[PDB]
Amino acid sequence: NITTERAVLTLNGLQIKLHKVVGESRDDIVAKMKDLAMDDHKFPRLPGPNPVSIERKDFEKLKQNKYVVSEKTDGIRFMMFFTRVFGFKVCTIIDRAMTVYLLPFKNIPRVLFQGSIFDGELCVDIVEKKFAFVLFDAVVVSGVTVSQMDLASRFFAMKRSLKEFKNVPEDPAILRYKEWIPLEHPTIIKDHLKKANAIYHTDGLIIMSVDEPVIYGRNFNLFKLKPGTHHTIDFIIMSEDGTIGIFDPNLRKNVPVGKLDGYYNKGSIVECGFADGTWKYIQGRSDKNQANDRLTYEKTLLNIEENITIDELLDLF
Numbered sequence: 662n663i664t665t666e667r668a669v670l671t672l673n674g675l676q677i678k679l680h681k682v683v684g685e686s687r688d689d690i691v692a693k694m695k696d697l698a699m700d701d702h703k704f705p706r707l708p709g710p711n712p713v714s715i716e717r718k719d720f721e722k723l724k725q726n727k728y729v730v731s732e733k734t735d736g737i738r739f740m741m742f743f744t745r746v747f748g749f750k751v752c753t754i755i756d757r758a759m760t761v762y763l764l765p766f767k768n769i770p771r772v773l774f775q776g777s778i779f780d781g782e783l784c785v786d787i788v789e790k791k792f793a794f795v796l797f798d799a800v801v802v803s804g805v806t807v808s809q810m811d812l813a814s815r816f817f818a819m820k821r822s823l824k825e826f827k828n829v830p831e832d833p834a835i836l837r838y839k840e841w842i843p844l845e846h847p848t849i850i851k852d853h854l855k856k857a858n859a860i861y862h863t864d865g866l867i868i869m870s871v872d873e874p875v876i877y878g879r880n881f882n883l884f885k886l887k888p889g890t891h892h893t894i895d896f897i898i899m900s901e902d903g904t905i906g907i908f909d910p911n912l913r914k915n916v917p918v919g920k921l922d923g924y925y926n927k928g929s930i931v932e933c934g935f936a937d938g939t940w941k942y943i944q945g946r947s948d949k950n951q952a953n954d955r956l957t958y959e960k961t962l963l964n965i966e967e968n969i970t971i972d973e974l975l976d977l978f
């Protein structure tokens with residue numbers, strides 16, 4: 662039976678009240694989304710791509726091939742999944758943790774429930790002070806497995822399925838679509854950004870291929886560019902005195918890599934920022950047990966070094 666507990670999400674000061682599916686219901690809805698998005702990945706994950714941080718080396722590849730660019734909305738990622746379950750026409754949004762919420766809307770055209778997986782962001786519309794779901798991309802429309810098309814194919818695929826659909830005040834989240842600009846349109850992009858920022862919280866640009874089929878996982882060819890004070894690592898407290906370490910797989914240990922200042926609990930996981938030659942404490946992470954691995958530390962440093970800027974991106978092209 663669809664078994665829901667209540668829940669609330671809170672974003673940028675506002676609260677949404679939704680129905681978390683729990684129990685065998687959560688599992689099926691997830692399982693169904695396995696089978697539709699045809700993901701034979703041993704372990705559970707949204708059928709979605711994960712961005713990676715742009716680094717200098719990338720520009721070459723950006724200069725050659727065809728990419729769109731967009732606002733990195735500051736929101737919660739979620740896979741929107743429309744399905745019928747046991748006779749209930751159901752609209753579910755899925756968190757990265759395979760957490761499932763009913764996000765229902767009046768006007769969802771019956772066909773969507775045939776099997777639609779679109780990929781988008783939950784976030785808060787600064788203007789209405791209302792919630793929105795911005796649609797990035799899409800993987801299956803109404804049974805039509807669109808993963809392998811090109812982006813735009815996918816985007817219109819999405820666009821016209823929801824064409825007749827209209828939003829009603831009562832509805833939980835305004836649907837909207839991500840306006841994806843082509844890289845070679847710098848002036849456009851800037852303005853697009855300065856438009857988007859006025860309505861939503863952003864964290865820089867996302868840079869996606871125009872042409873590759875949907876990627877499930879770490880998508881080394883999905884870029885993020887993120888204003889670089891928001892680069893963090895979770896170290897482990899290796900010493901009362903605040904020596905912090907990181908994990909090194911081939912050596913299999915945690916290795917000291919910095920010293921925080923003062924007095925800290927050994928074996929804590931602490932989220933830290935970098936500035937002025939040094940890492941600084943931000944908050945504890947009781948919720949971890951694992952520092953980041955060496956690579957990540959390396960990469961984030963590399964990244965904090967380069968201080969690649971939005972303009973550096975939107976000037977090359």
Ligand SMILES: Nc1nc2c(ncn2[C@@H]2O[C@H](COP(=O)(O)OP(=O)(O)OP(=O)(O)OC[C@H]3O[C@@H](n4cnc5c(=O)[nH]c(N)nc54)[C@H](O)[C@@H]3O)[C@@H](O)[C@H]2O)c(=O)[nH]1
Pocket residue numbers: 709710711712732733734736737738739756757782797867883885887
């Ligand atoms: N605050 C909050 N976040 C939640 C929650 N559940 C899931 N997240 C999710 O976790 C992400 C950050 O993870 P972490 O701090 O470890 O950072 P990274 O995993 O490195 O991600 P980040 O660098 O922040 O970039 C990822 C985010 O970019 C956003 N994004 C914007 N546009 C796109 C796009 O087009 N494609 C993709 N793949 N992502 C996009 C997504 O929200 C995505 O999560 C959030 O953005 C949110 O989506 C929750 O309950 N609260």
Ligand SMILES: [Zn+2]
Pocket residue numbers: 845
């Ligand atoms: Zn052109």
